[PDB]
Design a protein around this ligand. Sequence first.
Ligand code: HEM
Ligand code: HEM
Lengths: 700, 700
Amino acid sequence: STAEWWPKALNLDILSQHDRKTNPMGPDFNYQEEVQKLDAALKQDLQALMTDSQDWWPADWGHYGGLMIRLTWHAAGTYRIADGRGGAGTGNQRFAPLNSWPDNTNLDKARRLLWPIKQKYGNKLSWADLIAYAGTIAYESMGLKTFGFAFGREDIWHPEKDIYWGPEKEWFPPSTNPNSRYTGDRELENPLAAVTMGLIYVNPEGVDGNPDPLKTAHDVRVTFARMAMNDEETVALTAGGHTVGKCHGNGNAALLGPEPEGADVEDQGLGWINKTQSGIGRNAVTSGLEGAWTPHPTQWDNGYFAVCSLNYDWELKKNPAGAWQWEPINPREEDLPVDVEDPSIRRNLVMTDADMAMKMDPEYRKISERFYQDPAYFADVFARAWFKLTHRDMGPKARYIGPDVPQEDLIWQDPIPAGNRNYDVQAVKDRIAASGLSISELVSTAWDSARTYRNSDKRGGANGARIRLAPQKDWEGNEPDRLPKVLAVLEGISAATGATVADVIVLAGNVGVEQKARAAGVEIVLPFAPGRGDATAEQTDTESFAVLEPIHDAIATGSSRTMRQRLKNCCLIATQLLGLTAPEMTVLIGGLRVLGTNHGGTKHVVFTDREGVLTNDFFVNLTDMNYLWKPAGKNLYEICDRKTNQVKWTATRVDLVFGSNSILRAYSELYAQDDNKEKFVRDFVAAWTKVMNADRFDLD
Amino acid sequence: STAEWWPKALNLDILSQHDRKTNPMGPDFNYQEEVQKLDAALKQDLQALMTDSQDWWPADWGHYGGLMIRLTWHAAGTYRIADGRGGAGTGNQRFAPLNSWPDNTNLDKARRLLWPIKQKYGNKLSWADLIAYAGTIAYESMGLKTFGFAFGREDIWHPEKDIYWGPEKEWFPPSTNPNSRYTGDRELENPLAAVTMGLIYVNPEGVDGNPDPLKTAHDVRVTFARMAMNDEETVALTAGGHTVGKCHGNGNAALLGPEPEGADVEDQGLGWINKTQSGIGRNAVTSGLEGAWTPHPTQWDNGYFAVCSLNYDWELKKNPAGAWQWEPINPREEDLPVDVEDPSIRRNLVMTDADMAMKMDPEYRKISERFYQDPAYFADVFARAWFKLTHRDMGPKARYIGPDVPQEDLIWQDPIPAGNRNYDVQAVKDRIAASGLSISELVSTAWDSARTYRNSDKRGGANGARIRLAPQKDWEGNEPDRLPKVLAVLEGISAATGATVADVIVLAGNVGVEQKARAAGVEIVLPFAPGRGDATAEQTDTESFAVLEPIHDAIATGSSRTMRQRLKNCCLIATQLLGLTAPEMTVLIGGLRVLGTNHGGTKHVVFTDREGVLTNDFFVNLTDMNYLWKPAGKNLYEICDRKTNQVKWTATRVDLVFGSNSILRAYSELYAQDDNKEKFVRDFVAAWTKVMNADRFDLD
Ligand code: HEM
Ligand code: HEM
């Protein structure tokens, strides 16, 4: 197509996803308000589905719970803390490439089995919520006291183009190959939270397919941590997950047809279909391993650790489909799981390399032991972890809807109280104006408070005013000395008024922008919404926030250190997380530059003889051919006058890409037109507002 | 990215281009009304630019006309009749990949030279119009009486993803290579109108770089015909084009930097920049050939045929950059073009292989002779052809705006008169209802009248009611016997009322749809706009309309013959030309199917026990897993009941792709929800309306 030609080019399309032309819903359609009308006592239908076997994909022992829990687990298992991408918050498993990953084999059947319910509840039940709820109801039906559930996940209509899944151009390849995601000594390429392409967290047969429970344990600890789970939550999840259901590998795999995206139309959007021989029931082949972890896989119990992983000794075996798996030595007949179609036949137990790791790894072993001797703890830790798994990308509790939302404020939700809304905004502004804070100090501070937001998992943002807290107040990119000079003033204004520090930091930014538009002879009142609360250090997980540190921010031409990634690459990624379009990214850069907001007070792209005045000067000058651009070191250029051959300004790649990239320059040219001065200001303001209000889910 | 994984998948993204998130203009912005306010006497600024040389890319002999004419010519030269794609109607040359094609080398300089003007006139002058106007004003300034010009081309903001430019994964490769666009004996892959990738029409040095004017003449005739130009227009264009300007090839090419999309940010979005040595002025290297076709290249004259191509004899030479070119034998000094920087130095004349073809090809030679002995004719034929070149993708004259629009109605515009608007719509409807025409006969006829439309060059559509004319009335896909049974009735209703046959065919379709919604117990009045005119056979070019023949239409599950292209591929291409989104394509297919509109009255995807009733039955049944799909021959499937193993319905790939493609099935599922019956009807209607009104540029 139009570009395999220049693969180094910015993938600007990630900024224009989920737009009008792909969305089939009317423009006033609002899911939050339609799901609030849902008859959640739909729990009866979902629970009934569990024992409502369909011929084209029969339920094991007449119960789909194991399958449904795996569905939800896999929908959730794609999340990663580095950027908050992946997760069950958008129902992405119904689209490429996730619907066709090897690890999601046969989950297409699970999703399809949920369709009658989606058809019944319609627009009030998104595929995203349904897929995320399925496993929870399954657990309920099988005996587990779940912790809770919240609806509120809006559906998407095409693949999430912004997610980089890994460097491999092959499915589940060895870690000792070209295009490997591994470096040094088994050091996982940073963003990634899986050991290979097409897998959720870890290889069930062992690292690169070679069984050792100790090396497998290392991958499990690493990948789960990258998904926000610690040792306890991990052992809990693994055991709790395998307490029900089984592994399917009773047949030749090579006989499975193409994964969904590669199957032809006769397959109804399904995949991995066996047409050579029976591929359903006891003849089902999924992961390739075969057997169940517990005697009673249709029910919550203590069978996982209870004579199985801890009380029997295990040895390596090969299943019918050629996969490595662990089986018990001399198991008693009563402990053998029965056949999925005929209860009078006995089959075998199993443990994957990840299950054996729970017994062999010294640290997991201690936790395994606690859950073995204290099942009440196990069930509580698992239930909570199951809930965290399914909501870790839901964002603020304000987004949670439904009768079963837990009253408890969990730390991973980034709890923030409602701030006072009755306080007279204008008095707050006058006191801000009346302080000796520069237009520049006002804007940078507000920018920094809001820039932490990312729509991937909805964490960050200006609401709870955390920047004032550790570790944020000390982040290099946040300019710690200038930040307190400003917090000191603003904290005083808030105590003196009834407005929150969070509301004040934003309102101050708004003042800086208002002062700058006024200096260019433009009068404007920037929209504003009170209500931000101030969050406490107690409800702020210092370790989980490390991931939101601004190590890079092109919007303030700041780069903490030399990075592999191009500066505009970094710019593009922050703007995608922020939820901004290319036109929005463009005006923002042009505006912030003339407001004199660079980190370190650098003039890298000021291009104005009048900083502090909101003009379209950045574009007018960037687009002026009377100048030539001379590379001048690392991420730096000299903007020279062609006549005098003298250096007029300096600039970085973040600045110049807006005058190099054909699409961005087209935007730059527009804003540099003689007739678009007011449009630039109006558009800068709207984008500014969008950023300050991005995390405002507390609003209606 | 998200899919090199399944390259056979529908490129649905081509249906969601140019959306809100990429458009930087407010949503109420309307170019047609802003350009109507333009001070077209901007002709003075454009004309002044011609002699306003800029240091970073100096004008040859102090005149940019040759360069500007080439700019416009190349912007226009990308058009092709097979699908109407390409052309100067969107200003696509400012974006990838066209901005970086080898043939467009240094046109980046031309575009950049026009920026001060675009900056001055702003939102009232699109880049598309400016680029298309540049060459016309250049010709005016150099002495040619141009035929006219119309503004009205709206700007785009990213590459036109829908255009397939060719199969090559390399630039300008030989025709005797893998991935070649040539088959049998030099038979150009059909859609394409160029001999290789990255070139506009033909190779200037000869077929695959080997000079012979006779084989070159064959490519010129073939490519220009694919661009709607006959022998006369072609000789005219070639000679008229080369009557001014020159070829640039005075240097080592290998020294040129990367084309624009491959250049780094310091190049200001420009490309082919020489940093090793001087690459401007007389040292400029573009095509690689060097010399001018006429003694006086800054002026319109009769020098092209006048002692140059006809009166001097020519021989093969090699220019400084190693390109083949023809030079004259023993030219007199006065006929030598002077140096571009210093008038006191003489340089050389040249003729490309395409110019020599005008002298050597027997047929071109006769036309060349007429233009040599009758320059008034030459100038008139060229002027008209220059105008056709720059407007052949503008569509109906209704779209033309400006003081210089020619009063003459040119045949290639598909002229259609204004039809009467005062006639009482309801009386027309009652008479239609009162006829014995089936709901099916009404809908299919209207569909067929409107389906010919394509937004690529804005030709086709229900307005002028041509379907009633040759060759349309006899096209197989239009079902000639059923079409006249319906025209006979409808032609009578129109004569009896004051409404046009065109308005009547559409209104009839609207009645069929209204009758079908009524049968499903839904009352609706479909929007309607009177005014369509009936076009005459005299103003209808039977040969130019061949290209709009519906050889395929998935919307009515019709395929004239087995084709290389997948049926859904064909479906996707018609819907892109029609201007429809994926959600729109989806409801349309579902609706037309239950209305019983298949070509040949086939039941391939009816899936209703009630044809003629507008229900969401197609989706409800397509999405029902109680059925399995069994391939059953060419483009056919048997929809079988899983319990009884009996054939319930049949269907084609066009039907089943909506239940296979993950994105389309998501749409299908939505419309199959219990709560979306009315949404389906409302959405089907809106899409129906959009199609019936697509060519209505005559409306405000
Ligand atoms: C700790 C890393 C894990 C590994 C290596 C792993 C591996 C596997 C494998 C190979 C299967 C085979 C399924 C088939 O062939 O059909 C399976 C099934 C399953 N896993 Fe895991 N798993 C892990 C974690 C979890 C977690 C954390 C849970 C959820 C809390 C879970 C829940 C399930 C369920 C419910 C099934 C049953 C599928 C069915 O019965 O159809 N797994 N797992
Ligand atoms: C008939 C097929 C044609 C071929 C093979 C051809 C080839 C070329 C080539 C190789 C150049 C070299 C320019 C450079 O190196 O800078 C050129 C220049 C030019 N051509 Fe054509 N051309 C064709 C048709 C036309 C037509 C139909 C027109 C417009 C009616 C046209 C107008 C021009 C102009 C104005 C230039 C001058 C560029 C300048 O002075 O900077 N050409 N052409």
